[PDB]
Coordinates of C-alpha atoms in Angstrom, one line a residue:
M8 CA 21.4 33.2 -41.3
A9 CA 18.0 31.7 -40.3
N10 CA 19.8 29.1 -38.2
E11 CA 22.1 31.6 -36.5
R12 CA 18.9 33.4 -35.5
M13 CA 17.3 30.3 -34.1
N14 CA 20.4 29.4 -32.1
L15 CA 20.6 33.0 -30.7
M16 CA 17.0 32.9 -29.7
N17 CA 17.4 29.5 -28.0
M18 CA 20.4 30.9 -26.3
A19 CA 18.3 33.9 -25.2
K20 CA 15.5 31.7 -23.9
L21 CA 17.9 29.8 -21.8
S22 CA 19.6 32.8 -20.4
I23 CA 16.4 34.7 -19.6
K24 CA 14.9 31.6 -17.8
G25 CA 18.1 30.9 -15.9
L26 CA 18.4 34.5 -14.8
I27 CA 14.8 34.6 -13.6
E28 CA 14.9 31.3 -11.7
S29 CA 18.3 31.9 -10.2
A30 CA 17.5 35.5 -9.1
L31 CA 14.2 34.4 -7.4
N32 CA 16.0 31.6 -5.5
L33 CA 18.6 34.2 -4.4
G34 CA 16.1 36.8 -3.3
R35 CA 18.4 39.8 -2.8
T36 CA 19.4 42.7 -5.1
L37 CA 21.7 41.7 -7.9
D38 CA 24.8 43.6 -9.1
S39 CA 27.7 43.1 -11.6
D40 CA 29.1 40.1 -9.8
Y41 CA 26.0 38.0 -10.5
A42 CA 27.0 35.4 -13.2
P43 CA 23.5 34.6 -14.4
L44 CA 23.1 38.3 -15.0
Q45 CA 26.5 38.7 -16.8
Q46 CA 25.4 35.8 -19.1
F47 CA 22.2 37.7 -19.9
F48 CA 23.9 40.9 -20.9
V49 CA 26.4 38.9 -23.2
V50 CA 23.6 36.9 -24.9
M51 CA 21.5 40.1 -25.3
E52 CA 24.5 41.8 -26.9
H53 CA 25.1 38.9 -29.3
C54 CA 21.4 39.1 -30.3
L55 CA 21.6 42.8 -30.9
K56 CA 24.8 42.6 -33.0
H57 CA 23.3 40.0 -35.3
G58 CA 22.8 41.0 -38.9
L59 CA 24.1 44.5 -38.2
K60 CA 24.8 46.3 -41.5
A61 CA 28.6 46.7 -41.9
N69 CA 30.4 52.6 -36.5
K70 CA 28.2 52.5 -33.4
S71 CA 27.8 48.7 -33.5
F72 CA 24.6 47.8 -31.6
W73 CA 24.6 51.3 -30.0
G74 CA 23.2 52.6 -33.2
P75 CA 19.8 50.9 -32.9
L76 CA 19.6 51.6 -29.1
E77 CA 19.9 55.3 -29.8
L78 CA 16.6 55.2 -31.7
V79 CA 14.8 54.1 -28.5
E80 CA 14.3 57.5 -26.9
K81 CA 12.6 58.8 -30.0
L82 CA 10.0 55.9 -29.7
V83 CA 9.8 55.8 -25.9
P84 CA 10.5 59.2 -24.2
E85 CA 11.1 57.6 -20.8
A86 CA 14.4 56.2 -22.2
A87 CA 15.7 59.8 -22.4
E88 CA 17.3 59.9 -19.0
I89 CA 19.3 56.7 -19.3
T90 CA 20.3 57.6 -22.8
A91 CA 21.7 60.9 -21.5
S92 CA 23.2 59.1 -18.5
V93 CA 25.3 56.9 -20.7
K94 CA 26.5 59.8 -22.8
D95 CA 27.8 61.2 -19.5
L96 CA 29.2 58.0 -17.9
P97 CA 32.7 58.6 -16.4
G98 CA 35.2 57.3 -18.9
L99 CA 32.8 55.7 -21.3
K100 CA 34.6 56.0 -24.6
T101 CA 33.2 53.5 -27.1
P102 CA 29.8 52.8 -28.7
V103 CA 30.0 49.2 -27.5
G104 CA 30.6 50.5 -24.0
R105 CA 27.7 52.9 -24.3
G106 CA 25.5 50.0 -25.5
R107 CA 26.6 47.9 -22.6
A108 CA 25.9 50.6 -20.0
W109 CA 22.5 51.3 -21.6
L110 CA 21.4 47.7 -21.3
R111 CA 22.4 47.6 -17.6
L112 CA 20.5 50.8 -16.8
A113 CA 17.4 49.6 -18.7
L114 CA 17.5 46.4 -16.8
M115 CA 17.7 48.4 -13.5
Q116 CA 14.7 50.5 -14.6
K117 CA 12.8 47.2 -15.5
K118 CA 12.1 48.7 -18.9
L119 CA 14.1 46.5 -21.3
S120 CA 11.1 44.6 -22.7
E121 CA 9.3 47.9 -23.4
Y122 CA 12.2 49.4 -25.2
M123 CA 12.9 46.3 -27.3
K124 CA 9.3 45.9 -28.2
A125 CA 9.2 49.6 -29.3
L126 CA 12.2 48.9 -31.6
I127 CA 11.2 45.7 -33.3
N128 CA 7.8 47.4 -34.1
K129 CA 9.6 50.0 -36.3
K130 CA 11.5 47.9 -38.8
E131 CA 11.6 50.7 -41.3
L132 CA 13.7 52.7 -38.9
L133 CA 15.6 49.5 -37.8
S134 CA 16.4 48.8 -41.5
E135 CA 18.9 51.6 -41.4
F136 CA 21.0 49.5 -39.0
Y137 CA 20.0 45.8 -39.8
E138 CA 19.9 43.5 -42.8
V139 CA 16.5 42.2 -43.7
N140 CA 17.2 38.8 -42.2
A141 CA 18.7 40.0 -38.9
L142 CA 17.4 38.6 -35.6
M143 CA 16.0 42.1 -34.7
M144 CA 14.3 42.2 -38.1
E145 CA 12.8 38.7 -37.8
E146 CA 10.4 36.7 -35.7
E147 CA 13.1 35.7 -33.2
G148 CA 13.6 39.4 -32.2
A149 CA 9.9 39.7 -31.4
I150 CA 9.8 36.5 -29.3
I151 CA 12.9 37.7 -27.3
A152 CA 11.2 41.1 -26.6
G153 CA 8.2 39.2 -25.2
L154 CA 10.4 36.9 -23.1
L155 CA 12.1 40.0 -21.6
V156 CA 8.9 40.9 -19.8
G157 CA 9.7 38.3 -17.2
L158 CA 12.9 40.2 -16.4
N159 CA 10.8 43.0 -15.0
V160 CA 10.8 41.0 -11.7
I161 CA 14.6 41.5 -11.5
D162 CA 16.0 43.8 -8.8
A163 CA 19.5 44.9 -9.9
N164 CA 21.6 47.9 -8.8
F165 CA 25.0 48.5 -10.6
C166 CA 25.7 51.6 -8.4
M167 CA 25.7 52.3 -4.7
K168 CA 23.3 50.3 -2.6
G169 CA 21.5 52.1 0.2
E170 CA 21.5 49.0 2.2
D171 CA 25.4 49.1 2.4
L172 CA 25.4 52.6 3.8
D173 CA 22.6 52.5 6.4
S174 CA 23.0 52.3 10.1
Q175 CA 20.4 53.2 12.7
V176 CA 21.6 56.3 14.7

């Protein structure tokens, strides 16, 4: 279990660094078609599912966030109202994308890992989010605050000068 954690963290380090470097080279707003970003969401999900106690999957832990950081209220509500979103895993995926758009993911993950008593309801004692790897990942996520992503309508696609 301690090895699976280290592998996931090394997987996260690589995805975070690749996303940041690639996005900076690209220079424009990112959306769902951006492969380095799709990789980040998948790795982040694998990290959040690790050591989950045997069902909201990783959505369970993400729900606690708004109680620790009020600002996460709006996106939490948004996902509970997303058109056709029917599964917890789906809500967890939409929540991650909106958090990345808000440039708030590091803040939300740091708030969670710092409340292991609450997290224990959802994770085993040796889960990534319950261990040191989880804390390193939350710190590494701060670099993603530079990412400009929009998973909805982009104003630049609609504008025209009269």
